[PDB]
Coordinates of C-alpha atoms and ligand atoms in Angstrom, one line a residue:
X1 CA -38.6 124.7 -88.6
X2 CA -35.0 125.2 -87.3
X3 CA -32.2 126.2 -87.6
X4 CA -32.5 130.0 -86.8
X5 CA -28.7 130.7 -87.2
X6 CA -29.1 134.5 -86.9
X7 CA -30.8 134.4 -83.5
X8 CA -28.3 131.9 -82.0
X9 CA -26.0 133.4 -79.3
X10 CA -27.9 136.8 -79.2
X11 CA -27.9 137.0 -75.4
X12 CA -25.1 138.4 -73.3
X13 CA -24.6 139.1 -69.5
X14 CA -22.8 138.7 -66.3
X15 CA -23.3 136.1 -63.5
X16 CA -26.2 137.2 -61.3
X17 CA -27.0 140.4 -63.3
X18 CA -29.5 139.0 -65.9
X19 CA -29.5 138.1 -69.6
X20 CA -29.9 140.9 -72.2
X21 CA -30.7 141.0 -75.9
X22 CA -29.8 143.9 -78.2
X23 CA -32.8 145.9 -79.4
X24 CA -33.4 149.1 -81.4
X25 CA -36.2 151.6 -80.6
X26 CA -37.4 154.6 -82.7
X27 CA -36.3 156.1 -86.0
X28 CA -33.5 156.8 -86.6
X29 CA -32.8 153.5 -84.7
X30 CA -31.3 153.8 -81.2
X31 CA -29.5 150.7 -80.0
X32 CA -30.2 149.5 -76.5
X33 CA -29.3 146.3 -74.4
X34 CA -32.6 145.0 -72.9
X35 CA -32.9 142.3 -70.2
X36 CA -35.1 139.3 -70.9
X37 CA -37.7 138.9 -68.2
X38 CA -40.4 136.3 -68.4
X39 CA -41.6 137.2 -64.8
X40 CA -43.0 140.5 -66.0
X41 CA -45.0 141.8 -69.0
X42 CA -43.8 145.5 -69.3
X43 CA -41.4 146.7 -71.9
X44 CA -39.6 149.5 -70.1
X45 CA -36.4 151.3 -71.1
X46 CA -34.2 153.9 -69.5
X47 CA -35.1 157.4 -70.7
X48 CA -33.3 159.7 -68.2
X49 CA -29.5 160.1 -67.7
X50 CA -29.0 157.9 -64.7
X51 CA -25.4 157.5 -63.4
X52 CA -25.4 153.7 -64.0
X53 CA -26.5 154.1 -67.7
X54 CA -24.0 154.5 -70.6
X55 CA -26.9 155.4 -72.9
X56 CA -30.7 155.9 -72.9
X57 CA -33.9 156.4 -74.9
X58 CA -34.3 159.9 -76.3
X59 CA -37.9 160.5 -77.3
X60 CA -37.2 163.9 -78.9
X61 CA -34.9 162.4 -81.5
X62 CA -37.5 159.7 -82.6
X63 CA -39.7 160.9 -85.4
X64 CA -42.0 157.9 -84.7
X65 CA -42.5 158.6 -81.0
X66 CA -46.0 159.0 -79.6
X67 CA -46.9 160.2 -76.1
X68 CA -49.8 158.5 -74.4
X69 CA -49.8 161.1 -71.6
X70 CA -50.2 158.5 -68.8
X71 CA -47.9 157.9 -65.8
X72 CA -46.9 154.5 -64.3
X73 CA -45.2 153.6 -61.0
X74 CA -43.9 150.0 -60.8
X75 CA -42.3 148.4 -57.7
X76 CA -39.5 145.9 -58.0
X77 CA -37.8 143.8 -55.3
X78 CA -35.7 146.3 -53.3
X79 CA -36.6 149.4 -55.3
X80 CA -39.0 150.8 -58.0
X81 CA -39.0 152.4 -61.4
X82 CA -41.3 155.3 -62.3
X83 CA -41.9 156.3 -66.0
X84 CA -44.1 157.7 -68.7
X85 CA -46.1 155.6 -71.2
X86 CA -45.9 155.9 -75.0
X87 CA -45.3 154.0 -78.2
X88 CA -42.6 153.7 -80.9
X89 CA -41.2 151.3 -83.5
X90 CA -39.1 148.5 -82.1
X91 CA -36.7 145.9 -83.7
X92 CA -34.3 143.1 -82.7
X93 CA -31.1 143.2 -84.8
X94 CA -30.1 139.6 -83.9
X95 CA -33.8 138.4 -84.0
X96 CA -36.5 138.0 -86.7
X97 CA -36.4 140.4 -89.6
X98 CA -39.4 142.6 -88.6
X99 CA -40.3 145.9 -87.0
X100 CA -43.3 146.5 -84.7
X101 CA -45.1 149.5 -83.2
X102 CA -45.2 148.6 -79.4
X103 CA -45.9 150.2 -76.0
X104 CA -42.8 151.5 -74.3
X105 CA -42.4 152.7 -70.7
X106 CA -39.9 155.6 -70.7
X107 CA -38.1 155.2 -67.4
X108 CA -37.6 158.8 -66.0
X109 CA -36.8 157.9 -62.4
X110 CA -35.6 154.8 -60.6
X111 CA -34.7 153.7 -57.1
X112 CA -32.5 150.6 -56.7
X113 CA -33.3 149.3 -60.2
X114 CA -30.5 149.7 -62.8
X115 CA -27.5 147.6 -61.7
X116 CA -24.1 149.2 -61.5
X117 CA -21.7 147.9 -64.1
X118 CA -24.4 145.9 -65.9
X119 CA -24.7 146.5 -69.7
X120 CA -28.5 146.5 -70.0
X121 CA -30.5 149.7 -69.9
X122 CA -34.1 148.2 -69.9
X123 CA -36.4 145.3 -69.4
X124 CA -38.4 143.1 -71.7
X125 CA -41.5 141.7 -70.0
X126 CA -42.5 138.5 -71.9
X127 CA -45.3 137.3 -69.6
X128 CA -49.0 137.7 -70.2
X129 CA -51.2 140.8 -70.2
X130 CA -52.8 140.2 -66.7
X131 CA -49.8 141.3 -64.6
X132 CA -48.9 144.2 -67.0
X133 CA -49.0 147.6 -65.3
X134 CA -51.0 149.8 -65.0
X135 CA -53.6 147.2 -66.2
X136 CA -54.4 144.4 -68.6
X137 CA -55.1 146.7 -71.6
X138 CA -51.5 147.8 -72.1
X139 CA -50.5 145.1 -74.7
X140 CA -47.1 143.5 -73.8
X141 CA -44.3 143.6 -76.4
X142 CA -44.6 139.9 -77.5
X143 CA -48.4 140.1 -78.0
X144 CA -47.9 143.0 -80.3
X145 CA -45.2 141.3 -82.4
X146 CA -47.3 138.2 -83.0
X147 CA -50.4 140.3 -84.0
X148 CA -48.4 142.7 -86.2
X149 CA -46.2 140.0 -88.0
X150 CA -46.2 136.4 -89.2
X151 CA -43.9 135.3 -86.3
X152 CA -45.4 132.2 -84.6
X153 CA -46.6 132.6 -81.0
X154 CA -43.7 130.7 -79.4
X155 CA -40.2 131.5 -78.1
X156 CA -37.3 129.5 -76.5
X157 CA -34.5 130.4 -74.2
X158 CA -31.1 128.8 -73.6
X159 CA -29.1 130.4 -70.8
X160 CA -25.5 129.2 -70.5
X161 CA -23.6 129.7 -67.3
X162 CA -19.8 130.0 -66.7
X163 CA -21.9 134.5 -69.7
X164 CA -24.2 134.3 -72.8
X165 CA -27.1 132.5 -74.4
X166 CA -29.8 132.3 -77.1
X167 CA -33.3 133.7 -77.4
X168 CA -35.1 132.2 -80.4
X169 CA -38.3 134.2 -81.3
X170 CA -40.7 132.0 -83.2
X171 CA -39.2 128.5 -83.2
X172 CA -37.3 125.6 -81.7
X173 CA -33.6 125.2 -82.5
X174 CA -32.2 121.7 -82.4
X175 CA -28.6 122.8 -82.1
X176 CA -29.4 124.0 -78.6
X177 CA -30.6 120.8 -76.9
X178 CA -30.1 117.1 -76.6
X179 CA -32.6 114.3 -75.9
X180 CA -36.3 114.8 -75.8
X181 CA -38.7 117.7 -75.0
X182 CA -41.2 117.2 -72.2
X183 CA -44.1 119.7 -71.8
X184 CA -45.7 120.9 -68.6
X185 CA -49.0 122.8 -69.1
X186 CA -49.4 126.4 -68.2
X187 CA -52.2 126.5 -65.6
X188 CA -53.1 130.2 -66.1
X189 CA -51.9 132.9 -68.4
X190 CA -50.5 135.7 -66.2
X191 CA -47.1 134.5 -65.1
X192 CA -45.8 131.3 -66.7
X193 CA -47.4 129.2 -63.9
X194 CA -46.5 125.5 -63.6
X195 CA -47.3 122.7 -61.2
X196 CA -44.5 120.9 -59.2
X197 CA -45.8 117.5 -58.1
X198 CA -42.7 116.0 -56.3
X199 CA -39.2 117.2 -55.2
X200 CA -36.1 114.9 -54.7
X201 CA -32.7 115.6 -53.3
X202 CA -30.4 112.8 -54.7
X203 CA -33.6 110.7 -55.2
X204 CA -34.7 111.4 -51.6
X205 CA -38.4 112.4 -51.5
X206 CA -39.0 115.4 -49.2
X207 CA -42.3 113.7 -48.2
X208 CA -44.0 117.1 -48.2
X209 CA -47.5 117.8 -49.4
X210 CA -47.3 118.7 -53.2
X211 CA -49.5 121.7 -52.6
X212 CA -46.7 123.2 -50.4
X213 CA -44.3 123.2 -53.4
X214 CA -46.7 125.4 -55.3
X215 CA -47.7 127.5 -52.3
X216 CA -49.0 130.8 -53.8
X217 CA -47.7 129.7 -57.3
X218 CA -44.7 128.1 -59.2
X219 CA -43.3 130.3 -62.0
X220 CA -40.5 130.1 -64.6
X221 CA -38.7 133.5 -64.4
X222 CA -35.7 134.4 -66.6
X223 CA -35.3 137.6 -64.7
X224 CA -34.7 136.0 -61.3
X225 CA -31.1 134.8 -60.7
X226 CA -31.5 132.3 -57.8
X227 CA -33.8 129.3 -57.2
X228 CA -36.5 130.5 -54.8
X229 CA -38.6 128.3 -52.6
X230 CA -41.5 128.8 -50.1
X231 CA -40.6 129.1 -46.4
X232 CA -41.5 125.5 -45.6
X233 CA -40.0 124.0 -48.8
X234 CA -36.8 126.0 -48.5
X235 CA -36.3 124.7 -44.9
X236 CA -36.5 121.0 -45.9
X237 CA -34.3 121.6 -49.0
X238 CA -31.4 123.2 -47.1
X239 CA -31.7 120.4 -44.5
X240 CA -31.3 117.6 -47.1
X241 CA -28.6 119.5 -49.1
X242 CA -26.7 120.0 -45.8
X243 CA -27.2 116.2 -45.0
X244 CA -25.9 115.1 -48.4
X245 CA -22.8 117.3 -48.2
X246 CA -21.8 115.9 -44.8
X247 CA -18.1 115.4 -45.8
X248 CA -17.3 119.1 -45.5
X249 CA -18.9 121.5 -43.1
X250 CA -19.9 125.0 -44.1
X251 CA -20.5 128.2 -42.1
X252 CA -24.1 128.6 -40.9
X253 CA -24.6 131.9 -43.0
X254 CA -23.6 130.3 -46.3
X255 CA -26.9 128.5 -46.6
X256 CA -28.8 131.8 -46.4
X257 CA -26.7 133.1 -49.2
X258 CA -25.0 135.8 -47.1
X259 CA -21.6 134.1 -47.1
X260 CA -19.0 133.0 -49.7
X261 CA -17.5 129.4 -49.8
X262 CA -14.2 128.8 -51.6
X263 CA -11.9 125.9 -52.6
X264 CA -8.5 125.6 -54.3
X265 CA -8.2 126.0 -58.1
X266 CA -10.0 123.1 -60.0
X267 CA -10.3 121.1 -56.8
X268 CA -14.0 122.0 -56.4
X269 CA -15.7 118.9 -54.8
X270 CA -18.8 118.7 -57.1
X271 CA -19.5 115.0 -56.1
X272 CA -20.0 116.0 -52.4
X273 CA -23.1 117.9 -53.4
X274 CA -26.5 116.3 -54.3
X275 CA -28.7 116.8 -57.4
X276 CA -32.2 118.4 -57.2
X277 CA -35.0 116.9 -59.1
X278 CA -38.3 118.8 -59.7
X279 CA -41.2 116.6 -61.0
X280 CA -43.6 118.6 -63.2
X281 CA -47.1 117.8 -64.3
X282 CA -47.3 116.1 -67.8
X283 CA -49.7 116.7 -70.6
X284 CA -51.3 113.2 -70.3
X285 CA -53.5 112.3 -67.3
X286 CA -51.7 110.7 -64.3
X287 CA -48.4 111.4 -66.0
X288 CA -45.4 113.6 -65.0
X289 CA -41.7 114.1 -65.7
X290 CA -38.6 115.2 -63.6
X291 CA -36.0 117.8 -64.4
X292 CA -32.6 117.5 -62.7
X293 CA -30.0 120.2 -61.9
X294 CA -26.4 119.7 -60.8
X295 CA -24.5 121.7 -58.1
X296 CA -22.9 123.5 -61.1
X297 CA -26.3 125.1 -61.5
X298 CA -27.1 126.1 -57.9
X299 CA -23.5 127.0 -56.9
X300 CA -22.8 130.4 -58.5
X301 CA -19.2 131.5 -59.3
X302 CA -18.1 134.9 -58.1
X303 CA -9.2 129.9 -55.9
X304 CA -12.7 129.3 -57.1
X305 CA -15.5 130.8 -55.0
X306 CA -19.3 130.1 -55.0
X307 CA -22.5 131.5 -53.5
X308 CA -25.3 129.1 -52.6
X309 CA -27.9 130.2 -55.1
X310 CA -31.1 128.8 -53.4
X311 CA -33.0 131.4 -51.4
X312 CA -36.4 131.6 -49.5
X313 CA -39.5 133.2 -51.0
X314 CA -42.7 134.6 -49.5
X315 CA -44.1 134.9 -53.1
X316 CA -44.1 131.2 -54.2
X317 CA -41.7 129.0 -56.1
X318 CA -39.5 130.9 -58.6
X319 CA -37.7 128.6 -61.1
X320 CA -35.1 131.3 -61.9
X321 CA -31.8 131.3 -63.8
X322 CA -30.3 128.6 -61.7
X323 CA -33.0 126.1 -62.9
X324 CA -33.0 127.5 -66.4
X325 CA -29.2 127.3 -67.0
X326 CA -29.5 123.5 -67.1
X327 CA -32.2 123.3 -69.8
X328 CA -33.5 124.4 -73.1
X329 CA -36.8 126.1 -72.1
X330 CA -39.5 126.4 -74.8
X331 CA -42.3 128.8 -74.0
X332 CA -45.0 127.4 -76.3
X333 CA -47.5 130.2 -75.7
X334 CA -50.0 129.2 -78.5
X335 CA -50.4 125.7 -77.0
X336 CA -50.6 126.7 -73.3
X337 CA -47.5 124.8 -72.3
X338 CA -43.8 125.0 -71.4
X339 CA -41.2 122.5 -72.7
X340 CA -38.1 121.2 -71.0
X341 CA -35.0 119.5 -72.5
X342 CA -31.3 119.1 -71.5
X343 CA -29.3 122.1 -72.5
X344 CA -26.4 121.6 -74.9
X345 CA -24.3 124.3 -73.4
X346 CA -25.1 123.6 -69.7
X347 CA -22.1 123.3 -67.3
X348 CA -21.3 119.7 -66.1
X349 CA -18.5 117.4 -65.1
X350 CA -17.5 114.0 -66.6
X351 CA -19.5 111.9 -64.1
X352 CA -22.9 113.8 -63.9
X353 CA -25.2 115.6 -66.3
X354 CA -28.4 117.6 -66.1
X355 CA -31.4 115.4 -67.0
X356 CA -35.0 115.4 -68.3
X357 CA -36.7 112.0 -67.9
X358 CA -40.2 110.6 -68.0
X359 CA -43.0 109.5 -68.0
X360 CA -43.7 108.9 -64.3
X361 CA -47.0 107.7 -63.0
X362 CA -48.5 110.2 -60.5
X363 CA -52.0 110.4 -59.1
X364 CA -54.0 113.4 -57.8
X365 CA -51.9 116.0 -59.6
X366 CA -54.7 118.7 -59.5
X367 CA -54.5 118.7 -55.7
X368 CA -51.0 120.2 -56.0
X369 CA -52.4 123.4 -57.3
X370 CA -53.2 126.3 -54.9
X371 CA -56.1 128.7 -54.8
Ligands
F1K401 O1 -34.7 138.8 -59.5 C1 -33.7 139.0 -58.8 N1 -33.7 138.4 -57.6 C2 -34.7 138.5 -56.6 C3 -34.5 139.7 -55.6 C4 -35.5 139.7 -54.5 S1 -37.0 140.4 -55.0 C5 -32.5 139.8 -59.2 C6 -32.4 139.8 -60.7 N2 -31.4 140.8 -61.0 C7 -31.4 141.2 -62.4 C8 -32.7 141.9 -62.7 C9 -32.9 143.2 -62.3 C10 -34.1 143.9 -62.5 C11 -35.1 143.2 -63.2 F1 -36.3 143.8 -63.4 C12 -35.0 141.9 -63.5 C13 -33.8 141.2 -63.3 C14 -30.1 140.3 -60.6 C15 -30.1 140.1 -59.1 N3 -31.3 139.3 -58.6

């Protein structure tokens, strides 16, 4: 019921390279840094000596390894990872005090997957069984843990920008947030699908159809760095963000994310940039709430230099790290909902803060969902 002091501050990482938790697999225990991904469902770790890996999973040294003798080929964004399915004992050192037998994909070959210089050697798919590869019978890591232990079906994430954060498996830690929690319901249990009902740029309605905001789907994805928006939605968003930041003019390639914009030390004009507010469907009927991010969230540090961290998506809305770095996100799996509250560690200036406010009266919210 709080406070979960052991789990606090268990996530590490670098800007735009994902957040990883320390895990052990097999016996004797092999320590491996594993990226936290709520956009996938597969637990997959490096098993072959790839150039970018400092270390990997050695199946011959585990006396609790079991081969399933089944191959799997999984595509990611620009590349793909190909591996062999099996099972072993898994634990999280800075997590709950338990050990579980779980399905592990031993990554034997990968094309454009492992990031150079990054400290993680694997991926922890925390989404539901439906999108798990090869199919919906390969039980995802989190589902095993709940079934094999007394750990409640719930986990929360707090990603702090500049990089580190907290993954709390089993409960809600109060030291990690301020104000109140507002819950948007999960529509379907595959990705963590949510419904956006309205979008504002400095309190300026985009006047778009709410179904366009969720075109294909709207998901909360810890794996994804940037904030991703459908082609039509991305167009209007950049237009308004360009409109609000009129005072200074930026090269035309900056808005696509290809270019780098810089200012003198400290003198970063945060006030020139607008705030983005995403209204999400409430639990009550005809009720919603808005979540608000600052430029400190969508301008990613790389003189101080930043890259416009909002990109276009042909796969739907992806509320990635950019959105998540401003809040304390509770994935309340057992109650089919996702909670939002202002992050205690989120980056801000003296004059503006990230916000979560409600309730707001909104009609015809079901129509925002896509089929
Ligand atoms: O998701 C991203 N952006 C969308 C790219 C267009 S498909 C990546 C995330 N990446 C870390 C990572 C890498 C592998 C992974 F399985 C999960 C997360 C850092 C760079 N951006």
